[PDB]
């Protein structure tokens, strides 16, 4: 999230390995994660309440 | 140097607990516990 209005951004974390990723590669879905997904959070409160 | 958790990270952790934690089961568990304890507290005490 960038703000509570709806703007997002991409965030890159270096990791641990020193092997350089060659340019033009692809980062697999194994190490990519989405944003908050506020509707899931709000709907998860339903069983508790 | 450090950083406070954002509202996004906090709500993401809460949502992770709420979705991957089996929250719906609670509304069953408690319900059945109610059925155990409805009108039988004195009798459970004397049974003890």
The answer to whether the CB of B23 falls within 8 A of the CB of A47 is yes
Q: Find which of B6, B15, B28 to mutate to test the A interface (most A CBs within 10 Å of its CB).
A: B15
Specify the length of chain A in residues.
Answer: 49
Within 10 A of B12 (CB to CB), how many other CB atoms are there? 21
In angstroms, what CA-CA distances link A15 with A20, A33, B13, B20, B27?
A: 11, 14, 21, 25, 40
Contacting residues of A for B12, CB less than 8 Å apart: 36, 41
User: How far off is chain B from A6, nearest CA to CA, in Å?
Assistant: 12
């Amino acid at each position: 999230y960038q703000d509570l209005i709806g703007n997002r951004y991409l965030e890159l974390k270096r990791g641990d390995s020193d092997q350089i990723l060659p340019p033009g590669s692809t980062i697999p879905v194994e190490r990519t994660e989405p944003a908050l997904d506020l509707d899931a959070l709000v709907g998860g409160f339903r069983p508790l309440f | 140097s450090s950083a406070y958790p954002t509202i996004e990270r906090t709500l993401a952790g809460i949502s992770g607990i709420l979705t991957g934690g089996g929250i719906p089961n609670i509304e069953v568990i408690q319900t059945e516990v109610f059925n155990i304890l409805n009108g039988r507290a004195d009798q459970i005490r004397e049974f003890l």
